[PDB]
Structure formats: C-alpha cells, structure tokens
Design a binder for this molecule. Structure first.
Ligand SMILES: [Mg+2]
Ligand SMILES: [Mg+2]
Ligand SMILES: [Mg+2]
Ligand SMILES: [Mg+2]
Ligand SMILES: [Mg+2]
Ligand SMILES: [Mg+2]
Ligand SMILES: [Mg+2]
Ligand SMILES: [Mg+2]
Ligand SMILES: [Mg+2]
Ligand SMILES: [Mg+2]
Ligand SMILES: [Mg+2]
Ligand SMILES: [Mg+2]
Ligand SMILES: [Mg+2]
Ligand SMILES: [Mg+2]
Ligand SMILES: [Mg+2]
Ligand SMILES: [Mg+2]
Ligand SMILES: [Mg+2]
Ligand SMILES: [Mg+2]
Ligand SMILES: [Mg+2]
Ligand SMILES: [Mg+2]
Ligand SMILES: [Mg+2]
Ligand SMILES: [Mg+2]
Ligand SMILES: [Mg+2]
Ligand SMILES: [Mg+2]
Ligand SMILES: [Mg+2]
Ligand SMILES: [Mg+2]
Ligand SMILES: [Mg+2]
Ligand SMILES: [Mg+2]
Ligand SMILES: [Mg+2]
Ligand SMILES: [Mg+2]
Ligand SMILES: [Mg+2]
Ligand SMILES: [Mg+2]
Ligand SMILES: [Mg+2]
Ligand SMILES: [Mg+2]
Ligand SMILES: [Mg+2]
Ligand SMILES: [Mg+2]
Ligand SMILES: [Mg+2]
Ligand SMILES: [Mg+2]
Ligand SMILES: [Mg+2]
Ligand SMILES: [Mg+2]
Ligand SMILES: [Mg+2]
Ligand SMILES: [Mg+2]
Ligand SMILES: [Mg+2]
Ligand SMILES: [Mg+2]
Ligand SMILES: [Mg+2]
Ligand SMILES: [Mg+2]
Ligand SMILES: [Mg+2]
Ligand SMILES: [Mg+2]
Ligand SMILES: [Mg+2]
Ligand SMILES: [Mg+2]
Ligand SMILES: [Mg+2]
Ligand SMILES: [Mg+2]
Ligand SMILES: [Mg+2]
Ligand SMILES: [Mg+2]
Ligand SMILES: [Mg+2]
Ligand SMILES: [Mg+2]
Ligand SMILES: [Mg+2]
Ligand SMILES: [Mg+2]
Ligand SMILES: [Mg+2]
Ligand SMILES: [Mg+2]
Ligand SMILES: [Mg+2]
Ligand SMILES: [Mg+2]
Ligand SMILES: [Mg+2]
Ligand SMILES: [Mg+2]
Ligand SMILES: [Mg+2]
Ligand SMILES: [Mg+2]
Lengths: 58, 185, 159, 48, 172
RNA sequence: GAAAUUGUUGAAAGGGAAGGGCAUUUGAUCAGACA
RNA sequence: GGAAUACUGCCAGCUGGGACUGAGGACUGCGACGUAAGUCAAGGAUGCUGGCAUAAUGGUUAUAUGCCGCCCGUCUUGAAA
RNA sequence: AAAUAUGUAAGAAGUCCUUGUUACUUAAUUGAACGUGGACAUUUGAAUGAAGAGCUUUUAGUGGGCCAUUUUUGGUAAGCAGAACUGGCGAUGCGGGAUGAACCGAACGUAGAGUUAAGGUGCCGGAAUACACGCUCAUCAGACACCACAAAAGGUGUUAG
RNA sequence: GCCCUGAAAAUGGAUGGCGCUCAAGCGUGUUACCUAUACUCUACCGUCAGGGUUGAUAUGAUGCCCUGACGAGUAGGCAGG
RNA sequence: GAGAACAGAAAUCUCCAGUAGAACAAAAGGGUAAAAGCCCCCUUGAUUUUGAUUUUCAGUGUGAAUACAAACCAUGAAAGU
RNA sequence: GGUUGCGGCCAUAUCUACCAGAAAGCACCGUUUCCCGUCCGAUCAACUGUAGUUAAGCUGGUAAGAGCCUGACCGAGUAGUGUAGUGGGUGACCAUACGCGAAACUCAGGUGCUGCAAUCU
C-alpha cells in the first residue's frame, strides 16, 4: 500500500509551543577556531598584563 | 472563550514546604516563615527556601570550604550559616575560630570546629542571635559535583561519560571512540 | 531521483549581475575587517574558493576571526525550534561591511551632541525616536485654487 | 501607563443590535468591521 | 446601499516642499453616510488621477441639501454599469422631488431590471431636465399631460383582525 | 438462599419496538421543620 | 430678511411601567445632606401585613404531555452502520 | 522587476579620553588583540504587550492521518493521486446549514437575568401574511454560500438599454 | 434582465414538508422581531495565583481570612480520593 | 568580410571586423579575455602532522568541500600562488 | 586649465563619422656593438635622444548620430499582489472593501567625475 510521502504540516505549530528560543548571547564568547598564531601570542600577552597588574599590588 | 496566551492553572513550580516529613524541620520552618513575614530582611527569606531544598540541592559544605570563605577580605568574624550538613576535612591543617550555624554537623566537623574553640549553633539559635541575619555569611555546597550530573547531556562531541557498569579496555572504547575504529565520538 | 548537491538550486543566485562580469574591482580587497564588524554576505560566483553556502546568501553575521585571505563569520542558523551557532570561513570577495548599524552609530554620535548641547544650556532634551505622528490641523486656501469638480467617465473601447 | 493601567473593557453585546445583517464585512460595505469613525460611539454606548 | 445623502467631497494630494498647495478636486457623491462617501471619493479619484488615500488628504466634506424639496422635478440620469458579460453606459429619466430620492430609486431600478448591485454601478450625471419636451422617456412623459387624472381601481384594504364578518369590496 | 428466569396477586401504560434527557400536570408515597 | 423644523450629538435634566438578584453579618472605608444635633439611598434588604402549620411547599416515584435522544465495546482518516 | 514572505540592527556586554601587555604584526611601540586610569544615567535612546524570565533531569503516547480557502504537479476526469502556507477535523460538544467528521457562528464547571452571532420570522416553528420600488406566469416556473449540476445555440413572451 | 425552447432512465417522492403567483418567487432597500454551552452582571463549585494571620487563656498552621483570574478534551502523564 | 599559383564548398598564407556568438574530459547550470580558454617554460603542494569549519545532520557517521596552524617543497624578478 | 606616472568608481568613460590641438609631456621615430627573443630587431632586448613628425596614438569638440546614465502625477494608481464576505456567475472567470504597487511606453535633461606625485606658456 502506498502512503503519504512528506509534509511540513503542523511542524511550525510544534516548533512554537516551546517556541524558537532566541539565540542566547554571551559577553566573552569563545575563541574556538580562531587563528592559532594569534591565539598563541594572545596568551603571552595576557600573561604579561596580569603580571603587571600584580605589580600594581606589591 | 479566551484566546489564552499562557498555560492555564499552572503551578509555580517551587517547593513551598519541605517534602521532608521531620517535626523538627517543620518547626524550623515554622520559625522562619514567621521571621520572613515580619522582618523584611532578605536573609530570612533565603533561609526559608533552603529548608525546603531536597537532599541534592543541599550538597554538604565542608569545614575547609568554610575556612576559606573566612579568608575573605573583611569576613573573618562573620558567622557562617549552612542550611545542610557540614562535613569534616582532614586536608586543612589549621582551622579558624568562628561560629557555624547549620542543620547538621558531622561528628568530625563539630569536633574540628570546637577543637579550635569555635561554636556550632543550630539555625534556631542562629535566629535568636541574628533575627535579621546580621553579620551572617551563607555558604552552599557544590551541586554539580554529584556523580549523576556527569552523565547529563550525553551525546556525540559532548564528552560526558557513558552510563556504564563495568569499566576497562573493551568496555566502550572502540568503534566511535577512536579514529582507527570507524570514527570518533 | 532527487538531487541535492552543494550549489543546487543556485542558478541565478550565484549568477553574476548584468554587464558586471570579470575581475572584481580592487576596492573589494582594500577594504579592512576587524573582529566584531557586522558583515552582510553575498556570494561572488566568479570566486569559487571560500564561497558561502546558499543558505547564508543574503545573511548578516558578526566577524570572529581574521586570516590571510579570509574572515570567519558567525551566523545564528535556526534549525528545529532553536538557533545554533555556525562559523563561516569566507574569502573577502563574499563579505561586505554592513550598513545595518550606520543609522545607530550616526544616531549615538548625534545623541551625545544634542545632549551636551542641551545639558550645559538648561536641559530640555527629548532624544528617543518617535513614529509618524498623525498630522495637525491646517487651513488650505482657495485663493488661486478653487476646487475643480470631476465625475466618473463612461465606458469606451479604443482598440 | 495610564492606558495600560486600564484593564481591557468588557462590553456586553450591543443592545440595539448591530445595524447590519452580517458582521464580517467592512463597515463601508454594510458590515461591522473596520474604522467606522465617529460612529464608534453609537455602538460602544449600546454595548456599554 | 441605503438611503442616500449627497455630499460634496474635496481632496488633494498631500503637500510637498516643491509643491506646497496642490490642486484640489471636488466630487458630488451619493452615499448613506460620510464614511462611505469619503471612501467612494478615493475610489473614483484613483480612477482619474495619480493619488491614493495614503498620499492624499480629504479637505472638506459637506452635505448638500435639495434646493426645492417639495418641487416635483423631471430628472435625467446617466449611469455606467457592469453586466455579467460586459460593461454598459445608459440613460434613464426619473421623476421625483429631490436628487436624493431619485438616486434611491435608480439603484432600485438598476438592481430590479438589470440585476446591478451597488458595487457595479457608476453615476455619471444627475441633472434637472428643465424644459418639458427634452424629456425623452415615455414612462415619464405620460405624467406631464395637462389636467392629468386617474382612478386607482380595485382597492385592497388591509384587515386588522383575522376574521371578517362582511365580504369586502374594492370600490374606490 | 442473590441473579437471570417463572407463577399468582395488586397498581399502571400500550394506533409499526422499548428504554433515555430538561420540565411540569396528575396519582401514589415520604423526610424535615413548626412550636 | 427673520423664524421654525428635520437630522446628528450632548446634559454629572427630571420622570413612569416591568423583570431577575439580596452574596455579606458588630464596628472600622470614601462620602452625601445639614448653621447645628443629627440624618442618609454612602464597604451587598429591610420594613409592614396576611395565609398555612401540613403532604400545603418540597423530595421520591409511576404516568401523561412539549421539545429533544440511533448500540455499546473496538480497530479506523471516517461507524448507528 | 513586484506584493507576500526573509537576514541584521535600534546602547551600560554602550560611546569618548588617557596610555600598559606580547613571543603575533609593522619601516617604526606601528598595528592587532586584552587591559589599568578618567567623562556622561534612565527620553539610557522606536512601538505594543509581558499571570515574569532563565535553566536542568527524566519519562508516556505518537511516528496509517484526513479536510477547507489560497498557491500548485500528474490525470479528460474523479468523493482520484501528490506537494506549499495557514486554519481545521482526527481528540469536540453547543447554535446554524432539514439531514451530514471537516462549511458558518461559537469552543463547554453548576445556575439566574439580560444581550447577541450565524441563521431565520405564512403554517409546520420561537419571530412582521412588515414596509418599499421594480421584475417574473412556465400544459415539467422558481425559491439562498460550501451543496447535492447543466451547456452551445435560439424566442415577434416581457422588461429596461 | 426574468421567463420559454434546447432538457432522455429505471420502486412513489421531495425548494426539509405543506403550500405559495401585485408571492410565501427573483433583484434591492429600510425597520422591527425570534434564539447558542458565545458576550455583560450576579450567586455557588473547583483550579491557579497574590496578600494577611502563632499572642496567650479552646476546637483543624497540611489550617483560618482577604483578593483576582481561569474551567473543551482522545492517546497519554500526574494528583487528590 | 576582403585578398594569394595548382586549390575546387573544404588544404596553406595575409589583413580587417569580432563581449565570447569558442574552448575549459564528461550531464547541465554557474564562472572566465593581457583568463579559467591556446602555445611554451620549469615542476610534483595529487606531499607531511594533527585539530576547527560548511553541506547532508540527530546538528551522528560517511562523501565532498572551506579557512587557518606546524613542516618540507614548487614556481615566479617579485607580490604571490 | 594641459600633460605624465600610479590610481578609485568602471560606458555621462563605449561605439560610428568628421574637425581642431599652443606649450611641455607622451608618442611615432633612428640604430644593432652589447644583455636578450624571434621564421621575421614587426613584437620583445639593448644603444642614441642624436637624424625626422603631429600623420597616427593621445586629448577635445561637432552629430534632430547608435548606445549608455538620470528624471517625471508620461503611461499607471494600470498589470500583478496581502487581506474580507453565506459578494456576482452554470462554469470560465469577474466586481467590490482595507492595503502594497510594477515593467514597457512617452517626454525632457545629460555624455566622465575624481585621488597622489611630477611637469608645463
Ligand atoms: Mg507498503
Ligand atoms: Mg492512500
Ligand atoms: Mg508515514
Ligand atoms: Mg570524583
Ligand atoms: Mg574521525
Ligand atoms: Mg531534480
Ligand atoms: Mg570583460
Ligand atoms: Mg579546488
Ligand atoms: Mg437602547
Ligand atoms: Mg430587544
Ligand atoms: Mg428600541
Ligand atoms: Mg441573514
Ligand atoms: Mg447596557
Ligand atoms: Mg443642489
Ligand atoms: Mg434452604
Ligand atoms: Mg404503578
Ligand atoms: Mg421527573
Ligand atoms: Mg442577606
Ligand atoms: Mg445574608
Ligand atoms: Mg391538619
Ligand atoms: Mg410531615
Ligand atoms: Mg392545607
Ligand atoms: Mg418514566
Ligand atoms: Mg428526534
Ligand atoms: Mg475492532
Ligand atoms: Mg477502512
Ligand atoms: Mg520580519
Ligand atoms: Mg506593559
Ligand atoms: Mg508579572
Ligand atoms: Mg519523551
Ligand atoms: Mg519518545
Ligand atoms: Mg519512539
Ligand atoms: Mg502504526
Ligand atoms: Mg477554515
Ligand atoms: Mg486515531
Ligand atoms: Mg468542534
Ligand atoms: Mg443542531
Ligand atoms: Mg441543504
Ligand atoms: Mg410539517
Ligand atoms: Mg410563530
Ligand atoms: Mg413591525
Ligand atoms: Mg456563488
Ligand atoms: Mg442564453
Ligand atoms: Mg429576451
Ligand atoms: Mg434540492
Ligand atoms: Mg419554507
Ligand atoms: Mg425580497
Ligand atoms: Mg451558562
Ligand atoms: Mg462571570
Ligand atoms: Mg478539563
Ligand atoms: Mg486545556
Ligand atoms: Mg559546463
Ligand atoms: Mg593579466
Ligand atoms: Mg590523490
Ligand atoms: Mg553509525
Ligand atoms: Mg611639440
Ligand atoms: Mg644577433
Ligand atoms: Mg625597431
Ligand atoms: Mg625594447
Ligand atoms: Mg591631427
Ligand atoms: Mg598613450
Ligand atoms: Mg543618443
Ligand atoms: Mg490581491
Ligand atoms: Mg470566514
Ligand atoms: Mg469566494
Ligand atoms: Mg482586471
């Protein structure tokens, strides 16, 4: 016996009960897949300034 | 009819007494819902809720986690409140004085505290001394240090530990756990 | 049976704009991007390497990375009943800085002005935007302009 | 603030009736819906 | 569409910097209320000029009252109408006591004879046929002959109770 | 010593099923409350 | 020239008939009228009068009458089928 | 080259000044990133709403669908077969369409009073054998959406053009 | 435009039936009137929510009191009985 | 298109016009002119390491692809690729 | 203002026909020892700046020119379209209500703007 093949019927009804959640945003997102040359330096950079803001409270 | 825009007859979803069945727990609650209704002090309001908390949402605060909190700047004289049990911790070698107010103290903790000449207070003695919770430092334990939550969110590329009984090589470490056996995770 | 390859359905999407084929003009390359820049995306069919997938055509995203010949763009794509984060490695020929903010930025710079200009005078500001208000009363004159009276016209056929 | 403070008014159905034998055409077409301008007071009064 | 009033409506293309004081057009409009009247105005106006309500302004609306509401008058009426199969100009003559009565029965007649509903009709012109013998349709001329008199034969009085004890009579 | 199902007695109703719902008339039957 | 009137709208103008309801149970509020003492229709009915004191009202029941009512269970897109 | 649909943006995670960190980067303490110090509050930066918002765990049933308007493919067509968006039926009674899954109106705690919807008001049957202007006479008249069919072609019947 | 011809099927039969002809028909207009589990106001039930109340010397602190909104339901979940 | 012995519709030579009307293995659609097409020159980056990303998606796998990092090379005066 | 070298936007810069261009600059132009490339010093390489020319390039101007760019209640509130009705019609289809709104057409206006450095009667 054949039967229905496909439909989107009722699918956005379902998506909207719990509702298409807005994308959610963060201050300080991740560096995931950011350039490694950049990221390597960035590291030693932050090390330094930290150290220079430990000097601040000697 | 009404085009409703919100699910009707919804329960707020907050415990509103404890599920616990303990007289004494109920009395402490009797105490604090009175204080919470008549003292506009936020502390009483927080404590009232913490008493409803199930065992899991009450992880044990340790005596060493206690000792640390007191090394907070300007905090060493505060009386730490813990709505739950307080456990001992051999790993700290030196313990402060202070005054811990809590639900339960393990044998070892109450000793360690008292050995350095502190005080172990029950929450109701805490009330009589600090009805507005003056000078209190509330601590909570690690909720997500539970073994169970390890397995929450299990799926591909989530890194979360199988629900597994026996463990060792040849318990779920092959196809889909390494590049050389089909694929990986 | 069906076919659903990578650039399927894109006949006119990636197609090139009438009388505008050829080299891409050099300013497309002198332009400069930093992290956080908002960019709009549109594929240049003439540049086959580093090309956005059609779904991201017409889409706007934020820069998250800068490489030699490229920028990484994050887009939120909503799949299911939820958005997920997508990172796009695009070559500079498929990206342009967005104007979607120029009215904001222009407005802040100016809102800062009208404020200082007000504050150090004697307050009274009002610097939120407001929708089209309905218009006010008005007296239209007849002098030079008496009303002309039209009526409707009969049926005709010209053909 | 003033208007949000006001809880949505709850009118009864019009006393005189609606005018019209069918509500769901525009006022202008002999119906009831749409902007009917100053004729809104006749109605609302009959429902208030 | 109901019981008509006649309105002068006046509108005009929203002003602009380079064209303050645009030109002002009037229509006389038979409608049952001013709301329908302003609609009709915009309806024909977008049929004549480049405007629509969005970009234009009604300037003045005024009901015009019949000049001599108890003067019998011979009205020549001009109409454009749509039938099922085509559209059609047409001239009728109506005798009544005001342009407003006259347009009531035209719409009545158009509906009754040609099955034309209000949407499908366009008044071209209504004007008072001054000199008799420029009256053209007979069914009117008939009522201008001198010393006119007619009986109203076969009289039917409406009974007010269900039963009657007589057997009626249509003398008159 | 239940029920299906039966005999008798008593009461009722019945123009091609019966049973049911809202309501009241009519018959039968009955609790409470008055002080 | 000077009125009227219709039409539409307003009045925190007055006023008649009719229906349903009377939740609440000391006081506490916002008021109104009064020179005042008081008074009131102002955070929900009281006053006065009669009849019965029982199958009268009411319940139950059978019947009659008006309108209405297909056989439940099930599988099914869909069952009184 | 539309309409309808569609991405982003409308601030405190914001804008401006001062000038630290590095192994990246520059001819260059140049830049890039991350910072320390300082300037400005709710007309702090459109509307409307917000019985608040966010987050976590676990588990049932389900995984034959069907219909209506619109868009729409195959077919002469189908109460046929297959998609698009929404609204429905399925899972749902109530009023209307005599009747009827899906149309119209309207979604249901037990009730009183009122008012209405869609649909009606000769009698069946609650409600004008109301008012008003025309039209129609059928020896198979006609009579209300979905809906329970009719066409080309003709009439010196009659109406108005 | 209305009407007439074009217009043929099987049990007797359907504008819902009767019947209707200046209609009880067709087109259009104006009033009034009828009546849904819908709308408005009110009582009672239940659900959800927000308040208030441990002060003894009497009776439920899971209580008592105030206020507001809401109530369709297969499969299915949970709850109080 | 116009020109040159044999030479013809079609052999080889030249000039003019030439937006691609061609070619780019292959289906079709994109793309391309001092090239992505045609001729020549030098080559092995069709290599080594292990991650991120886009499509299909459960945001699994697989295929295919993208932009980087760390190598070693090719080519080019070079920027580069 | 011209011109050059490097440009940006890439036809208001393109196309066809014709005329005009001072000064400088570009240019055409001479040569073949040298590096270099060709069947061919035409291209490409080098050397002279000397021996010659505005003819071409280049620049500009003309044209009821082709094209291209702009504008407009020109056409048109037209086609098409979101939304409504127990609207019309046997149907095909079509009106109406609240909105959004083209393209062709037609007429007019235009025909490169401009950055950095050097140079020039
Ligand atoms: Mg099968
Ligand atoms: Mg099937
Ligand atoms: Mg299936
Ligand atoms: Mg552990
Ligand atoms: Mg793998
Ligand atoms: Mg295909
Ligand atoms: Mg080109
Ligand atoms: Mg490639
Ligand atoms: Mg009234
Ligand atoms: Mg009434
Ligand atoms: Mg009345
Ligand atoms: Mg009706
Ligand atoms: Mg009222
Ligand atoms: Mg007049
Ligand atoms: Mg026995
Ligand atoms: Mg009996
Ligand atoms: Mg009964
Ligand atoms: Mg009472
Ligand atoms: Mg009472
Ligand atoms: Mg007695
Ligand atoms: Mg008794
Ligand atoms: Mg008695
Ligand atoms: Mg009975
Ligand atoms: Mg029945
Ligand atoms: Mg079965
Ligand atoms: Mg079946
Ligand atoms: Mg949008
Ligand atoms: Mg609000
Ligand atoms: Mg709230
Ligand atoms: Mg589940
Ligand atoms: Mg499941
Ligand atoms: Mg399953
Ligand atoms: Mg199944
Ligand atoms: Mg529907
Ligand atoms: Mg089912
Ligand atoms: Mg239903
Ligand atoms: Mg019914
Ligand atoms: Mg029917
Ligand atoms: Mg009958
Ligand atoms: Mg009746
Ligand atoms: Mg009447
Ligand atoms: Mg129809
Ligand atoms: Mg015919
Ligand atoms: Mg005829
Ligand atoms: Mg029939
Ligand atoms: Mg009938
Ligand atoms: Mg009629
Ligand atoms: Mg009710
Ligand atoms: Mg109510
Ligand atoms: Mg329920
Ligand atoms: Mg529900
Ligand atoms: Mg190809
Ligand atoms: Mg080149
Ligand atoms: Mg290979
Ligand atoms: Mg697998
Ligand atoms: Mg010279
Ligand atoms: Mg040589
Ligand atoms: Mg030479
Ligand atoms: Mg050379
Ligand atoms: Mg010359
Ligand atoms: Mg040159
Ligand atoms: Mg030209
Ligand atoms: Mg449309
Ligand atoms: Mg509808
Ligand atoms: Mg329709
Ligand atoms: Mg049309």
């Amino acid at each position: 016996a054949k039967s229905k093949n496909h439909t989107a019927h009722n699918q956005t009804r379902k998506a909207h009960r719990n509702g298409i959640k807005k994308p959610k945003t963060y201050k300080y997102p991740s560096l995931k897949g950011v350039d490694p040359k950049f990221r390597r330096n960035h590291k030693h950079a932050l090390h330094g300034t930290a150290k220079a803001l430990a000097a601040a409270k000697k | 009819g009404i085009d409703h825009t919100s699910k009707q007859h919804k329960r707020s979803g907050h415990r509103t007494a404890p599920k616990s069945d303990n007289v004494y727990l109920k009395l402490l609650v009797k105490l604090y819902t009175f204080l919470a209704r008549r003292t506009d002090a936020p502390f009483n309001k927080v404590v009232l809720k913490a008493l409803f908390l199930s065992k899991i949402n009450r992880p044990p605060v340790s005596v060493s986690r206690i000792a640390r909190a007191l090394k907070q700047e300007g905090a060493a004289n505060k009386t730490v409140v813990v709505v739950g049990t307080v456990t001992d911790d051999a790993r700290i070698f030196e313990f402060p004085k202070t005054t811990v107010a809590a639900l339960r103290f393990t044998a070892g903790a109450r000793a360690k505290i008292v050995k350095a000449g502190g005080e172990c207070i029950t929450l109701d003695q805490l009330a009589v001394r600090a009805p507005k919770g003056q000078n209190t430092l509330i601590l909570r334990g690690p909720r997500n240090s539970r073994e169970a939550v390890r397995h929450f969110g299990m799926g591909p590329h989530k890194g979360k530990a199988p629900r597994i009984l026996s463990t060792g090589r040849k318990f779920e470490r092959a196809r889909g756990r390494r590049r050389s056996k089909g694929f990986k995770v | 049976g069906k076919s659903h390859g990578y650039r399927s359905r894109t006949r006119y999407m990636f197609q090139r704009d009438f009388r505008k084929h050829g080299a891409v003009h050099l300013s497309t390359y002198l332009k400069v991007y930093k992290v956080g820049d908002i960019v709009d995306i549109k594929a240049n069919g003439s540049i086959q390497k580093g090309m956005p997938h059609k779904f991201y055509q017409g889409k706007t995203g934020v820069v998250y990375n800068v490489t030699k010949s490229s920028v990484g763009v994050i887009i939120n794509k909503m799949v299911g009943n939820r958005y997920l984060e997508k990172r796009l490695n695009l070559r500079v020929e498929h990206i342009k800085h967005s104007k979607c903010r120029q009215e904001f930025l222009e407005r802040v710079k100016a809102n800062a002005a009208k404020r200082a200009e007000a504050k150090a005078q004697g307050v009274a500001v009002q610097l939120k935007r407001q929708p089209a208000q309905p218009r006010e009363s008005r007296i239209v004159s007849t002098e030079g302009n008496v009303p002309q009276t039209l009526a409707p016209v009969p049926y005709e056929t010209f053909i | 603030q003033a208007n949000n403070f006001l809880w949505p008014f709850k009118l009864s159905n019009p006393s005189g009736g609606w005018g019209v034998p069918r509500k769901f055409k525009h006022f202008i077409q002999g119906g009831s819906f749409g902007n009917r301008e100053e004729f809104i007071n006749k109605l609302v009064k009959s429902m208030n | 569409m109901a019981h008509f009033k006649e309105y002068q409506v006046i509108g005009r293309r929203l002003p602009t910097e380079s064209v303050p004081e645009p030109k002002l057009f009037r229509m006389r409009i038979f409608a049952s209320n001013e709301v329908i009247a302003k609609s009709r105005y915009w309806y024909f106006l977008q049929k004549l000029h480049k405007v629509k309500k969005a970009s234009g302004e009604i300037v003045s609306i005024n009901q015009i009252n019949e000049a001599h509401p108890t003067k019998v008058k011979n009205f020549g009426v001009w109409v454009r109408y749509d039938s099922r199969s085509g559209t059609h100009n047409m001239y009728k003559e109506i005798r009544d006591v005001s342009r407003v009565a006259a347009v009531e029965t035209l719409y009545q007649d158009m509906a009754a004879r040609h099955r034309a509903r209000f949407r499908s009709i366009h008044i071209l012109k209504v004007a008072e046929i001054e000199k008799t013998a420029d009256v053209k349709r007979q069914y009117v001329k008939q009522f201008l002959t001198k010393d006119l008199k007619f009986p109203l034969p076969h009289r039917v009085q409406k009974s007010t109770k269900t039963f009657s004890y007589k057997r009626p009579s249509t003398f008159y």
